[PDB]
């Protein structure tokens, strides 16, 4: 078996930078904010991402 | 295509409660939270409260927490508000709202009709009809003035006419009185003021009957 010359990545590292990016000022109050009126809805956050 | 329907308009003494209804076409409740909002005559919106079903959840603004209820009822696919406590500041004309994407967080993008709620402080009550009088003298217009509306701006004819002949829209304004008040202008070459006779209608207040005058200087 082969798996010995695949990489090592980092399987959450994604998730992890939008909770970092989540801990800025603001950003639950723009969630709170956002889900008002509606249980869904588009948001984008202070490094320009648009999150669900 | 998601639509809202409403209720019809309605008259209510002050103090006592009003619902609401609101049914929504082409959607489902719970993919569409409802946003009630309200607009005095002549003022602007007024963000009432919302329901999002799917929660199970409602809110209000705090102008209106402890007055306004809201409720849904999935079988019907339809969503009810109920504002109690009414108050002459409280006649407004009420929509139900909701929006097609995530996007518009509260960008309303489909709205209901529209529901007209009168805070009354009668009931159905007749007008009062009376004519004008030679005034001073090119052309020469003459009205015929009315008072003490209620039952909402009417409408009535018999003995009317086609199109043109001028446009009968005029205001209908309240008085201090609680009593609405419209006048009508009918405007003709000063001629015809010694030969033609001038029947002009007059709105009356339940909906189903009629005042004419005749003006004779």
């Known amino acids: 078996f082969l798996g010995f010359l695949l990489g090592v990545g980092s399987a959450i590292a994604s998730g992890v930078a939008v909770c970092k990016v989540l801990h800025l000022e603001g950003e639950v109050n723009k969630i709170k904010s956002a889900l008002l009126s509606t249980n869904k809805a588009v948001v984008s956050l202070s490094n320009g991402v648009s999150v669900l | 295509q998601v639509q809202l329907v409403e209720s019809g308009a309605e008259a209510k003494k002050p103090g006592s409660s009003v619902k609401v209804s609101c049914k929504i076409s082409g959607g489902t409740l719970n993919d569409y939270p409802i946003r009630w909002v309200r607009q005095a005559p002549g003022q602007g919106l007024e963000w009432m409260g919302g329901?999002?079903?799917?929660?199970?959840?409602?809110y209000e603004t705090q102008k209106f927490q402890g007055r306004l209820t809201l409720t849904a009822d999935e079988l019907t696919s339809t969503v009810y508000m109920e504002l109690r406590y009414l108050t002459s500041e409280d006649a407004a004309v009420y929509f139900c709202?909701?929006?097609?994407?995530?996007?518009?967080?509260?960008?309303?993008?489909?709205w209901g009709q529209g529901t007209r709620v009168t805070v009354s402080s009668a009931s159905t009550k007749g007008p009062s009809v009376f004519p004008l009088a030679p005034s001073s003298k090119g052309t020469a217009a003459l009205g015929c003035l009315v008072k003490d509306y209620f039952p909402e701006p009417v409408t009535v004819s018999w003995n009317s006419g086609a199109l043109t002949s001028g446009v009968h829209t005029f205001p209908a304004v309240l008085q201090s009185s609680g009593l609405y008040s419209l006048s009508s202008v009918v405007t003709v070459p000063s001629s015809s003021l010694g030969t033609q006779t001038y029947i002009c209608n007059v709105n009356h207040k339940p909906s189903n009957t009629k005042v004419d005058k005749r003006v004779e200087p």
């Open positions: 709202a909701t929006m097609t994407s995530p996007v518009f967080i509260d960008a309303l993008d489909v």
């Open positions: 329901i999002i079903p799917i929660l199970g959840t409602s």
